[model samples]
Target: VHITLDPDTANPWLILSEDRRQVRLGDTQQSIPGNEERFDSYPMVLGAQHFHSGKHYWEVDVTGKEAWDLGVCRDSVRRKGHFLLSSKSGFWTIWLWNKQKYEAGTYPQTPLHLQVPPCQVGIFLDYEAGMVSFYNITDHGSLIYSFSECAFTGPLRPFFSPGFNDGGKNTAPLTALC
Candidate 1:
């Protein structure tokens, strides 16, 4: 699937590439109106695609990035301020921190064990089945983690958070595979 980053839903601190396929953390916050769709605090963005039913799949290129959050979130999920990024809160996501610890966005946050970190992450969402699966694209599409039995309603959009630059350490932009 072709996914384009939605600037209207992006946080002011994030910089989306001209083509809107890539997003990265900027050194300083940008000047943009605090629209209802825009994130005021979180450094995240959503794809333009909307999935209400059927299966959807997309790959995100996190190569050379130390931290990131990827997956999907319901369109009605709260966009401004702080909110839990868990299934209970309408977000089904998997995240990597410091390039070592990996976890799924759940109420308790499930820990993931991966021998090798993937350069590209594949997200497979089966809305009808209420399942969201993550795959290690670099490892021949091996399983990373799966969120099952989710309660989904309304349209869901692809979620992305490139993570903070951490003083220029994790500066690589996240790219969605066309």
Candidate 2:
């Protein structure tokens, strides 16, 4: 289901179906606080109710925005298996979560970068394989990074943010397909 939250105007939270062809929950004009301008899109999978505990894919067309922050989360805490695909400049990265308290580590030091424009980012959370892969969505879908034997908490969702300041009147809306 595809649910959109427009924080600017008070609107109720909406729940969409798996195919994103219908609204199964909430009203259109109902206002939900705090989620004013945030938009969330997900698929209705048979395994999990939310996007947190399963493997999924999402594609979003982001345009006419100055800057933005995109990631995924299980709750308030961010999780892995989420990727950001940039339409403005084809750059994508995988966000890994540090669950344990640590002083320092090389794993958490750098952000993965894909040197390609108009590329789709791929994130694979293979619990059975005990690995997570970040790849370019191209001819071969080249692998950028892979974390082995890295078991992470399940049930993650794709999260994104369009920068608050649009420099001028914000006219573009962020769109996502799951």
Candidate 3:
């Protein structure tokens, strides 16, 4: 399945593709008028559609980005303050930095050690089974990490961040791929 970017929920510092398929951190702000659902404090965006339940899979292109955050989060997650990407906060995510370091922002913050960085990231969620997994599509769908027995009691949405500008290093437009 494919997801579309909700420009209204995009941070002011992000530029969304006209087709609304990709987003990237801009060096300067585009100053979008504020919205209650927008991630004002970070460069994050949620899919416009909600995934209520079932086995669903989607891919995202993080190619050439030195840093980013990706995964899924409950749509009701708090949109204010210093939010933590933990299950307790209604989020399950992964982070990458300097192009290689990986970490699963699970409840206890698990570290991920992948042989190679995923140029394209895949997420699979089985709502009834209470599972969510991340894959490195660069190597033919190698497992990156998976969260089992998750307490997915509500709807969830795909989460993404192009990351901070990093002096233009992580400016690659993150794309949702079919």
Candidate 4:
């Protein structure tokens, strides 16, 4: 699947490549105009397109990234202020933290133990089925986790977060595969 990162919805602390396919945590916040679409406190960006139905698939290039978040969220998920990434908050994502820790942001936050962490992750969203599944593309598309029985009422948007700079350890940008 092809995804164009929506710069208009990007957090000021995130930097996007000119093509909008890549995004990274910026060292300093930018001076972009604040608006409802922009994430004021979270370093996140949504896909330019929103999906209300049908199944969709996409891959994210997380090569060399130590910490990051990838998945999809309801189109109406709040962008301003602090909020959890749980399904209750309209976010269905898997995240890497502290370089090695991995977890799915479900209501209770499910921890994952992978033999081989994925350099690229695949996400499959079956809208009508209320399914959001993740795959470890680096491990021959092994299943990571799946969020099921979701109550999606609105359109959904692909979500990305490069995570904090962490003193330059995680400077690699998140790339949306074509």
Q: How large an RMSD does model 3 have?
A: 1.3
Write candidate 4's Cα lDDT for 1-178 as tens digits.
5789999899998999999889998888889887789988888899998999999999989998888999999998988899888888899999998749999996677899989989999999999999999999999999999999997889999999999757777888898787
lDDT score for residue 89 of model 2: 19
lDDT of 1 by residue, 30-108 (tens): 9987679998888899999999999999999999888999999989999888987877778889999953899988767
Q: Give the TM-score (vs. native) of candidate 3.
A: 0.95
Candidate 3: misplaced stretches above 4 Å? none
Deviation of model 2 at 27, angstroms? 24
- List model 3 lDDT by residue over 49-107, tens digit each: 78888898888999888889888889898776567788888888888975477999865
lDDT of 2 by residue, 19-52 (tens): 4322222323244454323333321111122343
**Which pairs clash in the backbone of model 4?**
none
Q: All predictions: root-mean-square deviation over Cα?
A: 1.2, 11.0, 1.3, 1.1
**Pairs clashing within candidate 1:** none
What does the lDDT come to for candidate 2? 0.36
* RMSD after Cα superposition, model 2: 11.0
Rate residue 147 of model 1 by lDDT.
Answer: 88
User: If ranked by TM-score, best first, what sequence of candidates would result?
Assistant: 4, 1, 3, 2
Among all windows of 10 consecutive residues in model 2, the one with the lowest summed lDDT is 96-105
Query: For candidate 1, what is the TM-score?
Result: 0.95
- TM-score against truth, every candidate: 0.95, 0.43, 0.95, 0.96
Candidate 3, 47: how far from true, in Å? 0.7
Candidate 2: segments with Cα more than 4 A from true spot: 1-54, 63-66, 76-113, 127-132, 138-140, 144-150, 164-166, 169-172
